Amino acid sequence: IIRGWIFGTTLDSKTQSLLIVNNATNVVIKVCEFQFCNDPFLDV
Amino acid sequence: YNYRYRLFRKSNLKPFERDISTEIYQAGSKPCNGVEGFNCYFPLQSYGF
Ligand SMILES: *[C@@H]1O[C@H](CO)[C@@H](O[C@@H]2O[C@H](CO)[C@@H](O)[C@H](O)[C@H]2NC(C)=O)[C@H](O)[C@H]1NC(C)=O
Numbered sequence: 570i571i572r573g574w575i576f577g578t579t580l581d582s583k584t585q586s587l588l589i590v591n592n593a594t595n596v597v598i599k600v601c602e603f604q605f606c607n608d609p610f611l612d613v
Numbered sequence: 614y615n616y617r618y619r620l621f622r623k624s625n626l627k628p629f630e631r632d633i634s635t636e637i638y639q640a641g642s643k644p645c646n647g648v649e650g651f652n653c654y655f656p657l658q659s660y661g662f
């Protein structure tokens with residue numbers, strides 16, 4: 570059920586954030602000023 | 614007039630740190646609430662080449 574992590578300061582597009590999404594051992598990684606789902610999850 | 618520097622900061626950068634924040638704040642420490650004015654100098658400033 571655990572499928573990654575968010576890292577940064579404010580975590581809400583006010584700053585650059587490292588996003589890691591995990592598919593057990595495959596990983597997706599990107600570093601934008603993302604706006605996620607505001608109460609975060611992988612959006613299945 | 615485009616070529617730009619943050620003229621002031623609230624701390625020095627870590628080596629190879631990138632910072633694209635854009636907020637007015639201050640040069641110094643006067644209460645300013647994100648509005649320009651005395652001491653409230655926006656650090657993003659540029660050169661007339
Ligand atoms: C990295 O980010 C942190 C915030 O998450 C910055 O820490 C704050 O720095 C100001 C002064 O610049 C202090 O007034 C705050 O009390 C600090 N907060 C915390 C929680 O420590 C920090 O300046 C940033 N580091 C760099 C090198 O830019």
Ligand SMILES: *[C@@H]1O[C@H](CO)[C@@H](O)[C@H](O)[C@H]1NC(C)=O
Nearest residue numbers: 590591592595596597611612
């Ligand atoms: C991992 O999951 C993402 C969606 O969360 C998907 O785009 C990607 O193709 C997946 N990769 C693998 C190898 O499972």
